[PDB]
Every structure is written in structure tokens, then in C-alpha cells.
Amino acid sequence: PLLRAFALSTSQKVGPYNVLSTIKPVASSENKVNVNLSREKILNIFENYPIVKKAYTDNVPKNFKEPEFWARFFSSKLFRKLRGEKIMQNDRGDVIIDRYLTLDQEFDRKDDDMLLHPVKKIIDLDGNIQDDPVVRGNRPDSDGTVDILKGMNRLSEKMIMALKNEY
Amino acid sequence: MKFYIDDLPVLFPYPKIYPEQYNYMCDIKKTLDVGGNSILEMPSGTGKTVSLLSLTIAYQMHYPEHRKIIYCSRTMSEIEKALVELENLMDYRTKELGYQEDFRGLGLTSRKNLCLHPEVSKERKGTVVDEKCRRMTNGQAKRKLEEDPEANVELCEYHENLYNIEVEDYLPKGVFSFEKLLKYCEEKTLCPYFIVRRMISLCNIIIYSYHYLLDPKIAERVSNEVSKDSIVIFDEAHNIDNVCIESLSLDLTTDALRRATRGANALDERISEVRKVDSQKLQDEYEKLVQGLHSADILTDQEEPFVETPVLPQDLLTEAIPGNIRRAEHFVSFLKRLIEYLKTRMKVLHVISETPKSFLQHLKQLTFIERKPLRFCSERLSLLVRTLEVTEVEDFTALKDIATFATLISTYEEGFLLIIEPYEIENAAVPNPIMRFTCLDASIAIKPVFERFSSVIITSGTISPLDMYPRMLNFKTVLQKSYAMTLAKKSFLPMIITKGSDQVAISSRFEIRNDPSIVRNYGSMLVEFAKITPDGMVVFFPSYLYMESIVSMWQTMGILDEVWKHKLILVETPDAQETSLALETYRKACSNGRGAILLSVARGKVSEGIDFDHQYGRTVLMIGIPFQYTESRILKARLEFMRENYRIRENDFLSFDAMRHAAQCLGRVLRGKDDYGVMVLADRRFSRKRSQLPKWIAQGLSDADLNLSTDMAISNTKQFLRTMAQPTDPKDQEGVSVWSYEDLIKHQNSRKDQ
Amino acid sequence: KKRTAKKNITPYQRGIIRSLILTLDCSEAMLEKDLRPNRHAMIIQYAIDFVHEFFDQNPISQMGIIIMRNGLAQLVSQVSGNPQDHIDALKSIRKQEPKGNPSLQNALEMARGLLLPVPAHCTREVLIVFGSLSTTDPGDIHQTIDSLVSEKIRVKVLGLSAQVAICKELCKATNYGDESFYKILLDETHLKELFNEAVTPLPVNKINKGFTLVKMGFPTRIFEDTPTFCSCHSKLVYGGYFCPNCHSKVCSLPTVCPCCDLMLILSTHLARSYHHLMPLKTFAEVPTTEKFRSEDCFSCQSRFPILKNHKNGKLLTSSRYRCEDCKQEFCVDCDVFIHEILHNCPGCESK
């Protein structure tokens, strides 16, 4: 029983969820060295987002990702994810940052593609809207930020699916 | 249960009952006894669907006359809601009775949500899918295939298996909800669409959306076999008038006009090439015009009809030749003149609105083209295309747009009104003139059904006041009754949060813009609620642009970070597919641990049919009160018609509409009486409208709960949530408000027979 | 105006042996200000009280304590039958402060692992004192719930000021469907009585399950003092017990023999059980004007009976709440005392 107890106390994966997210939102202050849960937070990032893990790995032999890597990461990612399109301002999203940006774009795209179920016909808003008729309405209810909304949707659904995974 | 209504066995599927349901049954039966309409507001807190279906099924299956039932829920979502519930009722009825069913009842929506052909249904836009199924199984491509066996013609073959076995007989016996129908007809490889569509002649009770009833462009196949006498039920009828109007209005944009120009050029090419190849058939069709309206193949068309008849169903149509239009080249020239006149009138400087008669005379002035030939343009174009047996329609979409416009503006009068807005002021001073055309009188679209059917019902969990509808729709009623939520407990907390913490009156009325006082106030409200309510919360902004700006600059502040820290956010976005996906994830999160917030638009698709049960909704909000005149003056024109034709002033009608949508939003958060949930509002103006609300909402909204600040609001709702959480189940006070199995109703009201 | 239980309708079976694994909640939520110090301090205090009580009334069971910090379930007391260990563990915790989010799933899985060794006749249980309004699971939960109900593990949880759907599902699921075990509180006193009612064994209507004879033996106290010597903690202890069969000393306990591993008890534990099995019929409150009985107490001798016609005072009631089978009176204090502390009904004993 001591062995069983120990083993269970060991292999105890923390949840994804908050800390996973938070690693992009709830983590905007400590611009110093290795912040809180440094290794823990970065691994939460890696499981949370492949792109940053890949970029950091690619930038091991040169360009240290400790201070300068994370400094440029602030600009690049924390503009890419999270808040609005920085577009202008500090466009430090360079080299690996920009490359991974380009990647992650279509990457999240293909992920979203990999997400589409044929939802059970109670909720099927798609078949619900307009796909009964062929009608002529009006519509009257300005780009950007729609991407923000898709971002939060995509984050949440990725989280939940990483949990339906039954890993 | 199996009680009686002094003649009617009622196989109500539940052991329990509700009192309001019993009153509902009594009164709806009383209606069906004597031909009337008798709108009935039954709060959605109960089960209106169960009562409706149970009583009506029992009536139809007990008396020998009213053999058919028509049920028109607003959207296919509620279509399948009624369907699944009806299926469960049917199973219960058989179970209690054995087998005395012989019953069929079918849903009916459209191809896009039914076509099972893999490649065909892979398409997105519903019109395209319709066209594809038409070509793949038409009266003509079949001939091309059979006479000429070749790779050119393929087929769903589902239509073929139908042709083999289904059109001799029917589906086995069930009231197939779309889940069941799709599964079965996938197994037996059928085409569900044509199945139900042909089946209409046999279903005991039919459920289809409003459009199929009022949209004349698809309400064509109404085969008086369907009723001729039937009992007809409008569920969720508070949004009727807008369905009529949207079924009769029409839009025009110069770009579509140029599209029509291109289509006309393609038409010239097609007519040239075919008359080079074959014109004798064209002259034969000339003769078939000269004999009459060509109903023999302009109407006796199992698969043909191309351009629908946007005019009312053939009532306002003549049958002679369209005179000179008999010549196809003549017709193309007519459309050329029409489109050019439309273009030049489109280049008009500023806003201008005209009666259809005035515009008609003006066209006559510029080009003497008469009304009578003009009316026939729709079927003329359609059957001309059939004679052309074209390979595609996309080139002719604008052509059919213009045909519809011509037919409408040439047919009706003194109820409609044109308007030519040269731009969109929200991005004013740009090239975008729109030839907006719309109706004003809602009664026009309805009038045929109230003419046709005798016994009709109107029902919603929200209708108020119960007199605006007789006014607008101009129809006679008998029983205009409202039902009160007899509850042994509070069960929900309407509030009016007029003042935030700053004790400042708030709304969305000021602009569609920012005013950081208002923004910060709302954000505080939202976040404290997100802290306090358990899983599941909704909000209903008054308009989409409003939400876009508000949330954008909420994200500007840190406000969204906190609600992120507590619950999930799931926004509402214009594309329907992503919306459905977000909504289902919202449900999945609510029933899971993490609480989740869905924020949508009151006018939007979400409020229309989606339901919010116990878990999925606790605390709706109404950020602001929904109003429309943000945008242009089409409402102004319709309201002008309203004031002149009905003794109704502007703000009266506007408030009425706003409270209509508010009540429709609010009612969603309850399903049974076990459910519960806060229903806050937020605006200064709400306080005076307390009487506009539906009764059962008003009762719970005591006087002391008016213009509360956010802080006292949070206090009260905290106390509520705690109190409701208690298992307050005396089960003897529930003998008052549940009328238990077979007895308390029997005893109580069999004595109340006084 | 009375607040009484109408009748007890499982006075035939209970789980006498138990292995209850209380799981606290030490997570950022428990730091709000609704209960006097906080949620957390009051919680742990009452937890100590409940530990004492439960190990009294069920003195043959075990218990283990589990926290939920930072989304992790960290065992703070092995499943053991000595109250003092758990008491000390809770003492230690109370000086430590919560963090992270409550990971209900992890705690559940840790429990299910923990209760495996418990034998078939012993009965399992968990008692989630869930305080927050969310969880944070690293896996499917319904998977775990299904595994649970597969392992015959009843669960009762005491939510704080809300109702969480998943917890309601959890209680409804494991307890053979019959939902009564998700009671949540609305006041501190309600909380005290919540723990109190958690103390007793738990019947609903037991499915016909295996009922099994269990080997055990009783010890005999020892005499010598200087010969202090212990075989369960390897110390010098001035005198203890002897396993009748293993025949080795064991420091004072109802513990299991650490040599031949058979349960040890005296009897008084069995006496507590007897008290729980077959309780009394709830004492009836005599009719106000129809009693015409003796004007005293019976078990005690109280002078609180009536007042004989006093407008509203006599119209109130007649403090004569009298038990059924012996049909003798008893003042309110005596009836409360009998039905709470000592369950031999005074008169019903005597005949």
C-alpha cells in the first residue's frame, strides 16, 4: 500500500485549464527573470501551444530564450494571442516569431478544421439558419476583433477537447 | 393520466399535471368547439407543447371530422422540438392503449438540412443545394439519362429508390423526428426531402415553419387536402408580423443590377444559339401562350417551376398572354429597358420614396411599358428558361431578382411603398444606392390563411398586449386570455437595474458608441454577476454593432480578464455555423464544471428558437432595451403607415415591439416549474414599461424591485440563489400548484364544476 | 407547530463498519468572507469536531483526510483508525493557507485508489466538503464516476452556498440513484448539524448484498508496569493489551493486531453499534386538552406541564411529549436528552 500511495502521489498530471490559459492572460507583470512556476508555466505553455515550444527549441543553439527570447516573445506572442492585433506599434514579432506566427495561423486553421463535428440536430444552428429556405432579407447590425472572438472560442474548445481526449 | 373534458379522453403523458395546463386544455377545447381564433398566452414556464399536442391529438382521434392538424413553429429548431415531444406523447399513448395509433405526423423543412446525397449536401448555400437537387433529379435530366445513357446525367438515386418503392406507400408508421427520419432514410438509402414532401397528402398532423405558411414564394404547394378545414396552431406567434413583412419585402443594389445586365447578355447569347438550332419549339410555346396561361406546363410541373411566384398565391394573377411579351426577344428587350430604367433611377441623388402606382406611372412616362404585361414577367422568364433548359442559374440570379421586383411592384398597391436610399450613412458618401422595396401592412400576407382556415389558434409564452395583434393583423378572435403562474414559491427575480454603483441612469439609447461611464458601469455589472451566479449565464445586447464596440473596448479594459478567471466566454458571431458550435460548447461547459457566459443579440438568431433549461440558463440580462431606429427610415415609413391606418402612435408601437423582443428573450430561461432563474434588466427607461411586460412576468416583478442599483441587485440575487438552493419541498403545498395524479384535478375541478 | 421526523423507514440495516475518507477543500475559493474567520478556518474547526464525533460513534472504522490545493489531492492522513493522528494532521493544516483551484477529479481518483485495501464487509464512503463553484479536471469525470459506482463507493458531499450540477449528478449516481445526499447548507448551525448527521451510518434501502462473518478477538489488559514494552510502536509503554491469538502486546486501541492481523475490540464498540441499529420510536407530543395524565415528569421530575386555562397560554400546548410503547410522559428536556444521548427509554426499560 505504501508503494501504491507513492505511485499515485507521483503521476498526477495537473489540469490544463486556468494555468494553461493564464499562461497567456494571468501572467502579465513579472518582466524580470524566471517568474512564478517558471518551468511549470513554460510546460503549461508547451502543452497549451506547440508553436512556442517549437520556436524555443529551434532557438536553443543560438539566441537564448531566457531573457531576450521571452522579451521578444512578449511583443510577438502576447500580441498574437490575447489582446487585439498590434499591427502597428512594437512589431518585434521577428525571425522565429514572425515565422511561427505565419505557421500558427494556418495551424490553428487546420486545428479548427480538425474540430468540426456533425453536431446533433437539436443545436444545428447551421442547418437551422437559412438552410431551410432561399430567402431575401436585409441585414443591418469594421473589420478585426472578430478574430479575437474566434481566438477565445478556439482556445476554449481546444482546452475542452484536450480533456475529452481521455489521455 | 386519462381524464376527461366532458367528452374527450385525454392521454396526457405525465402522472403529474399543471393547473395552468388544465385551464389551457379547457379553453383550447372551448375554442375548437366554436370556430374562432382566440389567442392564448401560456407562460413558457409550463409545457405549452405537451398541452397543445395532447389535447389536439385527442380531439382529432376522438371526433370524426377535424382529421388534420397544422402546427407552425417559428423555426426548424422548434419544429424538431415539437416533433420529439410529439413522438414521446405518441409512445405514451400507445403504451397506455396498446395499439390504436394508425398515426403519421411529419416535420417539413427544406433540402439544405435534409438532402442526404453526400456531394450535394456538402454544398453550403441553400439555394445552390436546391438547384443541384433540381438538376440532378428534374423532369428533363432524367429523360436525357434514360433516352441517352451517358456519363452526362447522374442522380441522387435516392429519388430513384423513392420512385421504386416509396411512391406506392409510405414510411412505416412513425412520427419521425429529424434524427429518426435521417437515420432510417439513410439506412434504407432514400431522399428524405421528397419523401415528406410527397407524404404531406397523408400525414395526420404536419409541423412546418412559418415561411412555408406565409412566404408565398414557397407556400405554393399548399394542397387544401392539407386542411380545407383543419385545426391550425401558431406556436410562438409573437414574431408573426415581421415574418410576413420579410416575406414580402425586397432589396436591390446596383451591383446586382450589373449582374442582371450580364445575365441578360447571356440570355441573348442563349436565345441566339438555340433559335439558330431550334425555334419551332419556341413557336409551339408561343401557341401554348396564345391558348392561355400555359398552366398545362407552367403549373402541371412535377419538377419544373424555376422562378417562384413572389406575388400572393395566384390570387392576383391574370391568365391571358402578356401580349407583346410572347416574343422571347421582345421579353429580353423588355428586361433590358427595365434594368436600364432601374439603373438611371438608381443614380438618383438622395433618398426618395414613392407609391408603386406613382413609380408605375413614372416608368410609363419614361418608357410606356404597361402594368398588365409587366406582371407576367416572373413566370414568363421562368418558363422561357425551361424552354432554354439552361445549364446554370447563377448567371440568372439577378434576372430572377428583377423578375420578382417587377411582379411585386406591378401587382400590389396602396399597401406597399418604394424607397431609394443612395448610400449607407454608416459609411456615407460612397457608391451604394439601394432600391429598397417593402410592404407595410402585415395583414396582407396573413389575410389568405384567415380567409382559408376556420379554426386557428395563436399561442406564445410572451404575447402582450393581447390587443395589438387584432389591431395590426385585422382578425376576429373569441378568447383572449392570459394565464398566471400559480407558484408556491418565488422561483425567479425580475429586476430593473437602472442605476449602477454611481447611481446613474444607464441605457443603450444614447448612441451606438462609447461613454466610459456607461461602459464601466455595465462591465462592473457583468463581472459581479459572473462572480455570483453558478454555471450558465446569458446577456442580450440590443444590436450587433453595439456588442462589437462594447466588447472590443471591454477587452480594452481589463474587465474581461476577471470573468475569464471565473467562467467561460462564448460570443455570438454572424456566421451561423460557428454560432452553433459556440452554443453547443456553452451547453457542454454549463453541464460540465466551468461556468460559461454566452452573450448574443436580442434581435439575433440566438433568441429565436434556442432554449435555455435549468442548467443552461440562470441569469439572463438585458443590457439596454432593444430598439431598431439606429438604422434608417424604413421603420419610419412603416410607422407612418401605422399611424395613418391604425390609431397607433410611434413611441407606442416602438415600445410595444421592444417589449415583445424583451419578453421573448426572457421567457427562455425557464422550462418547468422546478427550473428557476434570475431575469434582470438594465436601463432607466425600463421602469415605466413594467406594464408592457407579459402578465406572468409582471406578477413576479414587485414594485419594490424597481430602479434598483447594481449593488442591491447583487444582494437580492444572492439571497435568491441561496433560498432556491434549499430543498423547499413540502409536497403538501405542491398539492396546490401541481394537481397530482388523476385525483386533485379530478376532485378539485369536478367539484369546481359549479 | 412541530418540526419532527414523521417516521424512520430503514430501521433494519445500516453500514456498521465504515471507512469514510473525508476530503476537505483548501483552495483559493475558501478564502472568501462569508463565515466568521473565513470559510476555511471555520471549516477545519468543525472538521476537528466531526473527527472526534465520528470516531466516537463508529469506533471500529478508519478514516483518511484529503485536501485539494493547487488542483492536487495531497493525502494528509493515511487511512487509519487512531483519531489522534487525523486530529494532529488537521491541526497542522489549519495553520496553512489555501491556494490553487479545487481539482475534484483528482481527489476522487486518489480516494478510489485509497479505499482499495478495504475488505468487502467493511463499507466505503467519501465526504466531499466542496466549497468552490468549479473544478479543474485533468481527465474525463464521468469516467471516474462510472469507475466509482463500479467499485461500490457511496459518496456524500456538502456544498457551500450554491448548487453545482456535476456534484448533484455525483451524489445521485453513486448512491444507487436515490438522491438525498447532496445536502448543501444555508447557515453555520445548519453546518454543524450537517456534520452531525454525516456521523451516523448511512442507509437508504440497501440492495441485497453479501453479508459476511468477520474474525476478531478481544484483548486482556496487562499488569506489569516496569516491564514496559510495545509491539505496535516499539517503545517502552507501562502496560497494554494482548492479542488472544497473536499473543503480542499492543498499545491501547481498537486497532488491528500488528502481528497476526485480526481486529481487536472490547465490546463497548459493539454496544455503540447496537445503539445505532434499532433506535426508538420518536416520542409523541401528547394532545393539549386530551392528555389528563400525571402532572410531573417521569424520568426526571419536572414541574413543566401546563397552566390550566390561560386565554392563549394554555391554548398554546401541553408539554407532555410522551413516548409510545411505554406510554409514559416526559418533559421536553427529558425527551431531547433521551433521543440524543442515551437511547434506553426510561419507562420502556421498566415493566
Ligand code: SF4
Ligand atoms: S432529396 Fe435526394 S437528390 Fe435531392 S438533395 Fe436530397 S439526397 Fe440529393
Ligand SMILES: [Zn+2]
Ligand atoms: Zn505500541
Ligand SMILES: [Zn+2]
Ligand atoms: Zn495478534
Ligand SMILES: [Zn+2]
Ligand atoms: Zn423530565
Ligand SMILES: [Zn+2]
Ligand atoms: Zn417508552
